[PDB]
Every structure is written in structure tokens, then in C-alpha cells.
Design a protein around this ligand. Sequence first.
Ligand SMILES: *[C@@H]1O[C@H](CO)[C@@H](O[C@@H]2O[C@H](CO)[C@@H](O[C@@H]3O[C@H](CO[C@H]4O[C@H](CO)[C@@H](O)[C@H](O[C@H]5O[C@H](CO)[C@@H](O)[C@H](O)[C@@H]5O[C@H]5O[C@H](CO)[C@@H](O)[C@H](O)[C@@H]5O)[C@@H]4O)[C@@H](O)[C@H](O[C@H]4O[C@H](CO)[C@@H](O)[C@H](O)[C@@H]4O[C@H]4O[C@H](CO)[C@@H](O)[C@H](O)[C@@H]4O)[C@@H]3O)[C@H](O)[C@H]2NC(C)=O)[C@H](O)[C@H]1NC(C)=O
Ligand SMILES: Cn1c(-c2cc(OCC3CC3)c3ccccc3c2)n[nH]c1=O
Ligand SMILES: [Ca+2]
Ligand SMILES: [Cl-]
Ligand code: NA
Ligand code: NA
Ligand SMILES: [Zn+2]
Length: 806
Amino acid sequence: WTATSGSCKGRCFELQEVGPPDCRCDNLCKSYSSCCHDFDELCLKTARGWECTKDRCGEVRNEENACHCSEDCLSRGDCCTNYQVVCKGESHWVDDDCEEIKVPECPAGFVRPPLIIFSVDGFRASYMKKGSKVMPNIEKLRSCGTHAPYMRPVYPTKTFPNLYTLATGLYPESHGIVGNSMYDPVFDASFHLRGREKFNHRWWGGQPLWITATKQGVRAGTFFWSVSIPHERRILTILQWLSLPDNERPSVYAFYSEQPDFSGHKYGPFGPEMTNPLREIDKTVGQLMDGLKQLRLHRCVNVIFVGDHGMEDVTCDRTEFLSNYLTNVDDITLVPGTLGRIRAKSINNSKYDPKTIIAALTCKKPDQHFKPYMKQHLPKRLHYANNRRIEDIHLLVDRRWHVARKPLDVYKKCFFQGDHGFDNKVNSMQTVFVGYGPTFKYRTKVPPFENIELYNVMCDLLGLKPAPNNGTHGSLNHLLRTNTFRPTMPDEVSRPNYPGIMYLQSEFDLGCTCDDKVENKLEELNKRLHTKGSTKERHLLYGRPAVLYRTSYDILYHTDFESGYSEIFLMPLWTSYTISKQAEVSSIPEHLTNCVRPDVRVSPGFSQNCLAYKNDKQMSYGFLFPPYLSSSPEAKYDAFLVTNMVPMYPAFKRVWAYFQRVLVKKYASERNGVNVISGPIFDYNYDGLRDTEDEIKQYVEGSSIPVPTHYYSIITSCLDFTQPADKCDGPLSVSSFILPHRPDNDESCNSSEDESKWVEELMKMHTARVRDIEHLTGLDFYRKTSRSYSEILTLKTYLHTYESEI
Ligand SMILES: *[C@@H]1O[C@H](CO)[C@@H](O[C@@H]2O[C@H](CO)[C@@H](O[C@@H]3O[C@H](CO[C@H]4O[C@H](CO)[C@@H](O)[C@H](O[C@H]5O[C@H](CO)[C@@H](O)[C@H](O)[C@@H]5O[C@H]5O[C@H](CO)[C@@H](O)[C@H](O)[C@@H]5O)[C@@H]4O)[C@@H](O)[C@H](O[C@H]4O[C@H](CO)[C@@H](O)[C@H](O)[C@@H]4O[C@H]4O[C@H](CO)[C@@H](O)[C@H](O)[C@@H]4O)[C@@H]3O)[C@H](O)[C@H]2NC(C)=O)[C@H](O)[C@H]1NC(C)=O
Ligand SMILES: Cn1c(-c2cc(OCC3CC3)c3ccccc3c2)n[nH]c1=O
Ligand SMILES: [Ca+2]
Ligand SMILES: [Cl-]
Ligand code: NA
Ligand code: NA
Ligand SMILES: [Zn+2]
């Protein structure tokens, strides 16, 4: 109950929300159906419109008016935003030349430049160029400030997950808003766009920027706006707050527009009807900037213009129906649309089986427009598994498509022409970022980056210490004139051992064989130097990775590769090697086909054994340094060491062999040499983080050889490809992947064809950031470069998307 008989007199858009049944006058009261009776009359005034006119100039103040044109309005802070233009002969902000803002130019009593976050729903990245002619205020912000060509949203590319990621710096799996619609099995409660449950605080995890600010003594304007409050009123309210006395005035503000998303759904991302919504948004921006200019705040405030996701062409006729695949369609619940999530309709159904559901949904029609996954098998770059609100079964839907349970759901619930939610690397889902103000750089373009990085920057802009989050703090330092955050590299926790020759061949009883006993002081000194690390500068270009947890491991040197060998996991944590543009591919000689050689530096007790693989009828093995790329017939023996071996399903070896035999050489040719670091990943609990030894769920039969869930590789070269990878003077270029180690290739519908028709496509889907691999391995890469650490942090967050131009 709310006894709405109290009053909003002097309380309009109050920052501190009052507790029921005391009626509310805050910018959310409408949403809670709890405003005081006089809210509309006092707080949502509209009389005379939103603009001053020549005859209103100098007028006597009339408190019924929506905004004012009287002499006292500036000090009162409630002039219409075009007041000085109409009445005092000023120019609109957009018509002024831009001038570098070297320092904040703020009124006396401002303790820090305010931050205003201007967020636009469904503002696709390509609107910046394609709509440039009709958005002159936004074009000025973009060209005069700091801008990215696009900003990557999080998956799923829906509104709530992305706005809450913006506020927290967290992946949806960690902040808990994993979709626009959710069932939480622990609460046994559902979250929906319509309705009351979404206001319960138990949905919302992490620590959003407004709480971070408050806890550290920085005042915040309210971020959420009830949909009915007109945009002009939201802007005038912000301007009024900025006119409060020093002790009451917030330092951070948010504006939110439901456009262009709302029209985008109805007309498609580029429907002709889209011009007007873009014009109207640009007009709102201009009202904000004109209003700031009137208050002498237009060179004081930092403004962020940011979208939550883009918009794609999607119509009713592009719907796949689960009823075309499943006979049991009524025993499941589908969360539908541009992604799918499936659970059992009833938990009392003992016959429900996710394995047979997956199989009935796998590669059944030739151009099937969705792909089923257990959530732990989704591309790791999506970070979309570690939450009980994410159903075990997931459908990744092709761009431009919908999935639905039955045809009746679509025609009984064509309206729409646009939608979003798809894979966050899809071009049409990309969104925008512009930063403008004294703290941002002037006329600067920065590379694309992910929205999880913004929370840290907004903290930096406000002098706040960020809560723990998924951004990499420092990786956006190149956006900023000052207030950069200067992190130190993490300290290595475990130092390596450097074992020499310590074991005789006959001490090994591993069931391994190699035809290698075929026999010189010239080249015997030479081989010992290679084993002492004489070629390590060639194969370890950026220093060895640092181990950031407590463990026991060895550095092993070789002619062609260097490795950090885990005595706990019985295999390398990492293997590093460089392949020049000139390098040659050879084959495995016949006599060495099943050769596995004991490593006399490493005890039998800390070694894998061949008998375990013989006995394990499902498990085979591969090598981290590829024998195919050995530098000489004599160096090739090193690649057959038991310490270079790793467990691989036969199905996975098809993938791995094509990457090692074909793709590495191809990249070396295209990039002028590549350095490669490859290794295993164990993430059995799908939390995105390195598993400890006791979390491993599968071993090679009869052994303590743990089976990786994934294999990574990090492929680095010179950004200036006219310099060879091993002789690079400047910035680096990287691409990486985290391939799932799976016993079949069901994921790849064309896998019965030659690897050249399907392996690269799989690899592209499982592209990764170095930083993703770091979380998954507890390693820290690029420790020894000639580059600034912030620049290296940016490199570590780079994702190679394989999408055509934006
Ligand atoms: C992205 O960035 C984020 C933020 O840094 C990273 O997420 C963190 O991961 C940490 C490491 O796993 C994790 O630390 C754990 O915290 C537990 C206490 O957590 C509570 O308090 C914090 C602080 O206020 C709060 O943030 C948490 O909020 C989570 O949970 C609530 C649900 O109530 C949600 O509303 C909220 O959205 C968030 O959920 C997410 O995280 C949880 C995990 O905490 C997931 O389960 C959810 O799915 C969702 O993803 C909590 O309110 C603490 O109990 C843990 O300690 C256990 O393990 C350590 C290991 O060192 C051990 O020392 C302890 O003994 C303890 O073990 C005992 O309990 C076990 C389980 O009950 C039991 O098995 C044992 O036998 C022991 O008895 C642990 O320290 C941290 O909470 C989250 N933080 C957030 C905000 O998510 C994330 O990793 C990053 N991602 C990547 C890829 O890098
Ligand atoms: C969705 N929605 C919101 C709205 C605005 C938000 O932030 C605005 C700015 C910080 C990015 C939000 C931030 C986080 C979570 C939900 C949000 C909802 N207000 N009105 C409305 O319909
Ligand atoms: Ca893990
Ligand atoms: Cl959803
Ligand atoms: Na086997
Ligand atoms: Na297949
Ligand atoms: Zn939408």
C-alpha cells in the first residue's frame, strides 16, 4: 500500500527515495505506481513547450511553465535550454568551432568534473557514419572528442544485461542479469520486462557505479527513468541538479533513451522511418549541450555517449520451430527469440534427457539457422555459463533469425522487422562509444573495445576505486588525457626449476617406444647448448609467462621450442615457438610414426606413459610443438619427447593437425613470421578460471594424466608486417583461440568433409582474448617487451572477430 496523499511540493525528482506508504516523487515513482497525487502537476509541467521564443524573453516568472525565459532563470537553473540563444544572442553549441579542452573549466566549488552518461538503446555502431548528416550534435561530439569505430556489447546482446554490464564492469554470468527474461531455480522466481519482480534487489549482483560512488562519498543522480517522463524533462532535471549547491549536487548522472531501439524493432535497423528517431536523439543531445553551455559547464563536464547493443533485420518468416525437430516439444520450456535456452517443463519428469534433446537438434536440416550447445561448450569468449539462471541447453541463433517452440507462439502471442540478442561479435550488434570533455583526449580515434572496460574508466573519471570486475584496468588508458590508472604487473608466485640430465633411459617403464637409437664433438656441444637455452631468445620473444599460483614446474629448452612443464598436471602449461616466413613444413618420417621418447631431464614419476593411451580406447595423444615444423631432421626428435605430449581425442586431432600442419605456416607467410604459445586449459566447472587439481573430472584411463577441456594458442607478430616477428621494433599484433577439446565434431555440421572446409570456421567461432586465456591458465603473458604496460594490456584485451568491415 502507498497512501499517495502526501505532496511533491519542493520534492520533484528527489534523489533520496522515500519508504512506503510515504508517497514518492523520484524519477521511478511512476514505475512503482506510487507517486504523490500532485506529481504530474508539480513535476511533469508542460505548459508552453520546451523552447523560449522572442516574446517570452524577459517575461515575469510563471511557475506553471515547463521551463523559463525570465531573467532569474539562469541562477535558478531552470531556463529552457535555448534561452541564451533566443534571448541573449548566443550561438548553439553545435555551431561553435570545437576547441581543445586542456583542463576542466568549472565554476568555483566544483570538486571534480561531473560525469554525464548519455545512453541510447539499440544504437547500432554504423549509425554514426550512415546517419551523420542528420545528427550534427553527435557528429561534433564524435569528431571533437575521443571515439571508437564501435564498442562490443556482452552476450546476450539484450538491453538489461548490457546496461547492467555498463554499470558494473561484470559479465552477465557474474552480475546475474543473464537475459531480459530469467527463471532462478533457487528463488523459484521469474524475472520479466513487464512487472514487479525485476525491482527485487536479489536479481542484481556486483556493485553498480551509483553504489560505488555513494560508498566513496561521491553523490549520484538517479540512473533509471520511468518511460513516461519525456526526454526534455529528463534533460532539464539533470540541468537543475547541476545547479544545486556544492554539498547537494551530484557528480555522476545518467540519461537513457528508449530510442532508436523502439523504432528499430518496428522498422528494421535502416528502415526509412529510422531517420526521425535519429534526428530526435540528436536534438536531445543539443538541448543537453546548449543547456551545459548556458551554465558555463560545456567545458567542465565529461560526457559519455554510449549504446547498449545494435539492431539486426529479423522478420516472422525467419523463425525455426523446435516442433520441426522434437517429438517431445511440450515437455520443454524454451526462452525464445534471438537466442534459445531450454529446460524441462517439469522437474518431476524423470524421462527428460538433455542428451537426446541436443542430438535431435544437431545438424538436422541443411541450412539449419541455430546450433545447440550444452552451455559449457559455448565459445569461452561469451563468458556465458557460470550462473544457475543460465539453462544447461543453449541455442546460438544465426543473425537475422529467431527460434520458437511452435508456430502458434509466433502468430498467436508480421509485426517486427528488427531484433537483437545475437552473438556479441556479430557486426550488426556492435554499438557506439564517444567520450567528450577535459578528461578525454581531443580529436582521437581509439580501436574498438568491449563495454566491460567502461566501469573502470568511469571510476577513473570520478576518482573512485572500482569494485572487483571483469575489465582490465589500464587497458583503456589511451582514451584519457589524465587520471590514467597505472597498474603494476602481477608478481610471479612460482619460480621454475631448470632441470638438467638426471635420469637414465632404463629408469623409464612407460610402455613407450621410439626407433631413435641411430648415431661427434662439433654437434654434441651444439645440442647441449640448445638444451641449456641457447636458442631461447628466438622462441621466447616476450619473456617466459609468469605463473601466478603455487605449483611445481620446470623450464625445458629445445632447438625449436621452449616449454614450462607441470609436474602436477604431467604436461606443459605452455609451449612457445617462432616460425619465420621462410620456415618449411616437413612430414613425420615413417620410422617415427608412433615414437614417444623419455625425457631424461624429468623423472618417470612426473611423466606421462604410453600404456595409458593404449589402454584408453577413447583417448589418443598429440604434441604441443608440431613435429611438422621442426628445423632439421635431428631437431625433430625433440618434438617426440613425452614432455611435449598431451591427451587428445581422435576427433580433436583432426582439428589440431590441420592447425599445426597447415594453418601455422599460412599465418607465418601472411604475417611475416609468427610466435606461437600453445597449451592445455582445464575448466570443468565452466567458471572461466583455471581449475585446481581437485576439480578435474576426467583422466586418461588408469592414470593420473588429466584431460584438458580446451587447447589454446596465442599467435603474435609485428603490427608492421614489413618487420619479421622476431625482429619487431614497435607495436604487436595478436590473434588467439580457445578450442574445445571434444570427443566428436558434432559442432561442425560439415566435419565429414576435408578439414580445409570446416576447421578454420570452428577456429573463428572460438576466437579469444589473451586475457581470457590468462584467467583460464593463471599465466601472465608479454612480461618482457619494449612496450608500455598499458599498451600490452590493450593487446591482451584484443579480440580478432573475423567479421568484415564496419
Ligand atoms: C569477473 O569478475 C568477478 C568479480 O571479481 C569474478 O567473480 C568473482 O569470482 C570470485 C572467485 O570465484 C568469487 O569469490 C567467491 O566469493 C564467495 C563470496 O561471495 C559473496 O560475496 C561477494 C562480495 O560481496 C559477492 O560479490 C558475491 O556475489 C555473487 O553471488 C550472489 C549470489 O548470492 C549473486 O547475487 C552475485 O551475482 C554473485 O554471483 C556470481 O558469483 C557466484 C560465486 O560467488 C556464482 O556462484 C554465481 O553464479 C555468479 O556467477 C557473493 O554474495 C566466497 O564464498 C568464495 O569462497 C569459497 O571458495 C574459496 C576459494 O578460494 C575458499 O577460500 C572458501 O573456503 C569458499 O569455499 C567454501 O564455500 C564453497 C561454496 O559454498 C564450498 O564448496 C567449500 O567447501 C567452502 O566451504 C569465493 O571467494 C566472487 O564472489 C565473484 N564475485 C562476483 C561479483 O561475481 C569473476 O571470476 C570474473 N570472471 C572471470 C572470467 O574472470
Ligand atoms: C531500461 N531503462 C532504464 C535504465 C537505465 C540504466 O542506466 C542508464 C545509463 C547508465 C546507462 C540502467 C542501468 C543498469 C540497469 C538498468 C538500467 C535501466 N531507465 N529507463 C528504462 O527504461
Ligand atoms: Ca574453473
Ligand atoms: Cl533473454
Ligand atoms: Na587410445
Ligand atoms: Na560434424
Ligand atoms: Zn530492443
